[PDB]
Design a protein around this ligand. Structure first.
Ligand SMILES: [Mg+2]
Ligand SMILES: [Mg+2]
Lengths: 43, 683
RNA sequence: GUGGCGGCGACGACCCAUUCGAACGUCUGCCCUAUCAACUUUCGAUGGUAGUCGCCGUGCCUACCAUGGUGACCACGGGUGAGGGAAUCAGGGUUCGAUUCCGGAGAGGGAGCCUGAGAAACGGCUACCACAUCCAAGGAAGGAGGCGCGCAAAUUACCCACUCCCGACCCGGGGAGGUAGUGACGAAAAAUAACAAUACAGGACUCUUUCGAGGCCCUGUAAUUGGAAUGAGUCCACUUUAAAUCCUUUAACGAGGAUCCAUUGGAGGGCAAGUCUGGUGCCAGCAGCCGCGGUAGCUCCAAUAGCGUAUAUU
């Protein structure tokens, strides 16, 4: 501990996971659902 | 040597939690996660100053390390940080199955090794024991869990499911991570996965609670009026002190019949309030006191606060009161009898719940875990004396409703402040909504449609039900609130059966729908159907064993798991309407899945910023979906008069009634069937 | 030809002898105590017959018998620093020599039990008693010395090269055994210098209660000068040894104020615009790194790698 930062001493998928332009919460907002098989999308 | 700077957001998260007395959650991804928890534990030790943290390790079947000193030395026969970590920290190891043992005790940090086997019962018990600023760490070592995580973030609708059981609960768990404020996804390298959308904004708080402020004031103001004041001094939270004072005022009443009720959830001090209340009675002239519970072992914290409350106000361990222990191997260490002779003669005795006799000379009798005692036995314990009742949150409500209608004095308090951690914790709030262990306090009243005439049954889609979209979530909350308001015993594991168990279908009846509506229609009744036989259950085996019928078992049938109607609309006949419609459907009178990802195509999928795939509808009409041919319909329920009339009116013929009543309810399970083989069984 | 004859070894094997022994006897001979004179039959003392057990003989023991056995020539009883001895070999300047031999018992405490030629086991087990440890609380595993003197390292390291022992064995093993540390209680030997020369002065030295009596083939000078010797230290190489250290050889550096600088105890001399105290004007005692300003290494005596003080004492 240097009071400013912390110093301590498969992978391709996570590298894709790190590089995501849109967070999953932002993805959720755009999502919409349809009830009765035909209706105005609630989202 | 080359050292890697890590994001300060990890340290910022830990430091804020311990200061705010709020827990935080971590999700380590990768096979080397066991290395990561070592570093995360060490950071926690730096922040906390109270003591060295304790670690709880939960696993399903297999643990990589030995956890026994001598075995691990021989197994080794150049230096690993993990091996030092195991020998150093005070770790308590538990099984997923054996999680009941760790219910009472408290741990600094909790580790959930096996993600795929997670169960709602497991999550509630382990997280509750975490205290203060401790960490909840969940590991994703299996290759399947990584790619399931991989698919969902690229496209929310797309999901990866191998081959049986869909496993929607794990998908719901992954989706629910974003909503939690104190959740941080991490790799095998100390690297954050940026998906929470609150992670980027996370910042350190600058270097004491509202409810705590009054408790200090009450502890100062009640010094004038004591021995009341000494009792609230031993209290830890404000809500206990309010419960204590309302207990003692009920004691001071010059009335033969009075009832005070505790309605307290787990994690909130409940036996503590009763323990001080018993000491308050001993401080007064009350002499004959009885305590009732299903088992003497169950009440151990109760007598401790009686022991604690006695210690505060005189009552030396041997000079004034003497404790008589169990003196038996079974139900050991329980203090059934305690006698205090400082002021004349006062005695407190634990008795079996089925002891309406021996209660002739009673002043105060306290019932504990009242939900666990059969209901008729509770009525016998009421008596003409003062009664204290405590029932845990998460029929008893009707019984207090009858009391409110009356005779007996009624007092109601609920405990809402957790002893272990501070109110408002994000981890607890996230856990409750994910498990749906909370119900709306107020339900809006709606207009009643014609009961037997203009209601149509609908087919609820299981897949689009559990997707975490706002509209599906609300209807999910509505149906379960009706589902758990039933007289049937409620367990958090019931969610997993509706979510994962195959051969299970959900049907709900709705009011007649005009063209233009609001977001969600009101639900009146829901019925859950489990398909059995040709298309392994209670009905096929119990019938076969008792009647020894070879032809039976080759027939196709389903059983009703749960049938429920809204309490306000109860008693006017919505339930009968659903049964009639369902019979027409399965007899064939009515005229007759989310995109899965290939195993090799998991990597081939790219990010889709705007979802395009059409989600399957929530509710489908009965005519649209094809129907299976079911020869018979069945029900299994604890025999009660009100259901006995109902199912007989529905045409179901009893075929079996269980000899031994259930321990908790005192009810004999009854099985009924409806479709000449029934006539043979009936005779 | 399911012919017939065969060598040199290894291991095992009944019995006899032998060796190593082990175990019961015979005889001979033990220190002090009589203010211990009688003892033994106080679960047999003496013996006879038969038997059990034991490796065998036997009161070793059991049944059935007799009444015996010892004693002032000291029975019996009680004692006895019973670390100390006992011996052995070898020797010219008197021996600061060397080594061995034991009386038994135990393995947290008293009992029971298993193997073998040899143990009632230096080792397993059961019960009981007493301790103490781990655990998911269900169960499981166990049998000695240092400090308290201002002071805790051998409570270790290396090797079977020597001497010998055990094993299937020429070779493996041996905390049997061997090798390696500190040290003004003490004892012994010994450095810190030697040999020459020059220059300048005139006075040494003994006795003597202030005068004095004797007397010289030299003395002093913190004077100068010269080139020979060497070890404290520094540091190559062999040799030594299982490996290494140590001892013994040995190459190269290592001295003029040779500052490469001996101490401990006793007794004296020398001093200012200095401080204090007391008087007999100018004195005396005590003492003096301190003064007006300035801060960039005197002499004599005794012992000698050794020498004092305090208490008691002869
Ligand atoms: Mg000496
Ligand atoms: Mg010279």
């Amino acid at each position: 501990y240097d009071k400013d930062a912390v110093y301590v001493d498969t992978h391709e998928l996570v590298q894709s996971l790190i590089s995501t332009h849109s967070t999953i919460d932002a993805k959720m907002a755009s999502s919409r659902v349809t009830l009765f098989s035909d209706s105005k999308p609630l989202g | 040597m080359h050292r890697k700077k890590v994001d300060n957001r990890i340290r910022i998260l830990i430091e804020n939690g311990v200061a705010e007395r709020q827990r935080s959650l971590f999700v380590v991804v990768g096979d080397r996660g066991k290395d990561q928890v070592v570093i995360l534990h060490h950071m926690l030790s730096k922040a906390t100053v109270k003591a060295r943290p304790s670690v709880l390790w939960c696993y399903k079947k297999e643990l990589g390390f030995s956890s026994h000193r001598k075995k691990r030395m021989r197994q080794l026969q150049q230096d690993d940080p993990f091996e030092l970590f195991i020998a150093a920290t005070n770790i308590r190891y538990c099984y997923y199955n054996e999680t009941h043992k760790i219910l009472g005790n408290t741990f600094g940090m909790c580790v959930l090794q096996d993600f795929e086997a997670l169960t709602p019962n497991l999550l509630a018990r382990t997280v509750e024991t975490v205290e203060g600023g401790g960490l909840v760490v969940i590991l994703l070592r299996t290759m399947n869990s990584l790619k399931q995580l991989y698919t969902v973030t690229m496209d929310v609708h797309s999901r990866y499911r191998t081959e049986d059981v869909v496993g929607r609960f794990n998908e719901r768990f992954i989706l629910s991570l974003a909503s939690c404020k104190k959740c941080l996804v991490i790799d095998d390298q100390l690297n954050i996965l940026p998906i929470s959308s609150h992670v980027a904004t996370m910042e350190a708080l600058p270097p004491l609670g509202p409810s705590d402020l009054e408790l200090r004031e009450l502890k100062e103001s009640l010094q004038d009026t004591q021995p009341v004041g000494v009792l609230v001094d031993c209290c830890k939270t404000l809500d206990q002190a309010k419960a204590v004072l309302k207990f003692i005022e009920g004691i001071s009443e010059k009335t033969l019949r009075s009832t005070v009720a505790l309605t307290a959830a787990r994690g909130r001090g409940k036996s503590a309030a009763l323990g001080l209340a018993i000491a308050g009675a001993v401080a007064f002239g009350y002499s004959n006191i009885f305590v009732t519970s299903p088992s003497p072992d169950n009440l151990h914290t109760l007598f401790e606060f009686v022991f604690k409350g006695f210690d505060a106000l005189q009552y030396q361990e041997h000079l004034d009161y003497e404790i008589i222990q169990s003196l038996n191997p079974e139900f050991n260490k329980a203090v059934i009898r305690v006698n205090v002779f400082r002021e004349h003669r006062q005695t407190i005795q634990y008795i079996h719940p089925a002891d309406a006799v021996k209660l002739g000379q009673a002043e105060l009798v306290v019932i504990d875990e009242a939900a666990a005692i059969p209901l008729p036995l509770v009525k016998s314990l009421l008596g003409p004396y003062l009664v204290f009742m405590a029932s845990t949150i998460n029929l008893s409500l009707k019984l207090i409703q009858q009391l409110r209608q009356q005779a007996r004095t009624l007092y109601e308090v609920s405990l809402q402040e957790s002893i272990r951690y501070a109110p408002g914790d994000a981890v607890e709030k996230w856990l409750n909504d994910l498990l749906c262990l909370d119900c709306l306090n107020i339900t809006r009243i709606v207009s009643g449609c014609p009961l037997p005439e203009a209601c149509e049954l609908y087919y609820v889609n299981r897949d689009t039900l559990f997707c975490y979209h706002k509209a599906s979530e609300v209807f999910l909350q509505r149906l379960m609130a009706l589902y758990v308001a039933s007289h049937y015993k409620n367990s958090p594991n019931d969610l997993q059966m509706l979510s994962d168990a195959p051969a299970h279908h959900l049907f709900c009846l709705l009011p007649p729908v005009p063209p233009t509506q609001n977001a969600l229609p009101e639900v009146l009744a829901v019925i859950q159907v489990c398909l059995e036989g040709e298309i392994g259950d209670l009905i096929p085996w119990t019938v076969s064993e008792q009647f020894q019928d070879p032809d039976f078992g080759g027939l196709s049938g389903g059983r009703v798991v749960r049938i429920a109607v809204h309490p306000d609309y109860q008693g006017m006949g919505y339930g009968s309407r659903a049964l009639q419609l369902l019979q027409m459907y399965y007899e064939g009178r009515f005229p007759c899945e989310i995109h899965t990802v290939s195993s090799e195509a998991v990597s081939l999928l790219e990010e889709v910023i705007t979802p395009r795939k059409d989600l399957p509808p929530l509710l489908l009409k009965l005519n649209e979906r094809p129907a299976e041919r079911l020869d018979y319909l069945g029900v299994s329920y604890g025999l009660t008069p009100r259901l006995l009339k109902f199912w007989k009116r529905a045409g179901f013929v009893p075929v079996y009634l269980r000899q031994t009543p259930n321990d908790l309810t005192g009810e004999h399970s009854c099985i009924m069937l409806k479709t000449g083989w029934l006539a043979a069984f009936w005779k």
